[PDB]
Design a protein around this ligand. Sequence first.
Ligand SMILES: *C(=O)[C@H]([C@H](O)CCc1cccs1)[C@@H]1N[C@@H](C(=O)O)C(C)(C)S1
Length: 359
Amino acid sequence: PVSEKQLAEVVANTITPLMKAQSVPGMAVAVIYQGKPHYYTFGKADIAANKPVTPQTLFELGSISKTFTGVLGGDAIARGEISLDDAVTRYWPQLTGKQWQGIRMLDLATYTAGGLPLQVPDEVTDNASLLRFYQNWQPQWKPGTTRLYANASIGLFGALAVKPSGMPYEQAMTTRVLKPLKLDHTWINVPKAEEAHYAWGYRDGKAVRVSPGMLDAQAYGVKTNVQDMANWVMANMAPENVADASLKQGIALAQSRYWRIGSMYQGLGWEMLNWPVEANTVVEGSDSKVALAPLPVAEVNPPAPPVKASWVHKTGSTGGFGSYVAFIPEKQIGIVMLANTSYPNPARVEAAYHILEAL
Ligand SMILES: *C(=O)[C@H]([C@H](O)CCc1cccs1)[C@@H]1N[C@@H](C(=O)O)C(C)(C)S1
C-alpha cells in the first residue's frame, strides 16, 4: 500500500520538473486514493502580487467545464425533462432551418451534428445573433457520422437542456449539481468576496484571465479550486455515494458511451478509453492535431452504460490556464492538475499517467 509520504514524493518529482520545463507559475494538484483526496500546491497564483497557490486558489477550467454540462444534461434526462433522442427543434422551435431536421440533442452534446465549428463567432453577442448563426450554418456532414469537437455544439446542448426546468443555466447548475455536491466555491461568475482567491493566468509572461463569450458557461467558463475539483472527481468516480437519485443517474449518463472514435469513446463532456490503456495511446490522442480533427464515428446503440474499467478524462485550457482531470473507477484512483499556464496537452497526460501509475 503506497505510503502517504511516497505519494507526495512521486507528485513532487513529477510536478516540479514539469513546471520548470513548461514555465508554469503555479499548480494545484489533487490525487484521489483510498477514498479521499490528497492535495499538493506549487508556486504562485499571482506573480506580481506574490500570492502563493493554495487549495482555495481559483483556476479557469476551460473545456473541463463541459463535464458539468454533461452531468447537468444527464440529470435533466433522469428527471424526464429531456431525451437525448429528442430533436433540437423541440427545445428551440425558432430554429426553423431545414438542415436541423434529423439532428438530435445527442448530436449537440457529443459533437456529431455534422460540422458545427469549434467556436461561437465573436459577433454573436445576443439571442438574435445566436439564432442567425445556427440558422445560417450549413453542415459539411450528415448527423451522426463525424465528430468535430465544438464549443458551439455542446454549448447549445447545455442551453437547451435546461429549458424545460424553467431555470436559467447558471441557476440550474447550482441547484441541481453544485449545491447537492457541496461544490460551494465553483463559479461561473466570481463573487466579490472570493476575488482574492482568483489566480491570474499567464501567457508569454503576460497576466491574463478569460473574457466573456456566448455560451461560455456551458463550454469553457467555469472557475474552481482544487478542493471542489477533487470532490467533483470523487462524485463522478463513485456515483454510488451520491444521494440524489437523478443526479446519481445523470453522472452515469455522462460517462455512458455514445460513440466510438478510434480508441476513444465519447460521453457527455467526459471522454473515455478502456482500461488498461498505455500512456502513448492517451498522450497521442491528446495532441491538438488529433483532438481538433473531424473524425468518423461508430454509433454505440443503445448507449453503453458506464464501464468501470475506463480511463475517464478531460483536458481544458483558456488563454492563461491549463488543466487536466483523469480517473479510473475500477481502481478508485484519480487526479486533478490545475495550472495557470496553458502548456501542451501531451505533457499534462504524461505527468498524470505517471503519477497514477504509482498507485
Ligand atoms: C477547451 O479547453 C478548448 C476550448 O476551445 C476553449 C474555448 C475558449 C474560449 C475562450 C477561452 S477558452 C477546447 N478543448 C481543448 C481540449 O484540450 O480538449 C481543445 C484543444 C480540443 S479546444
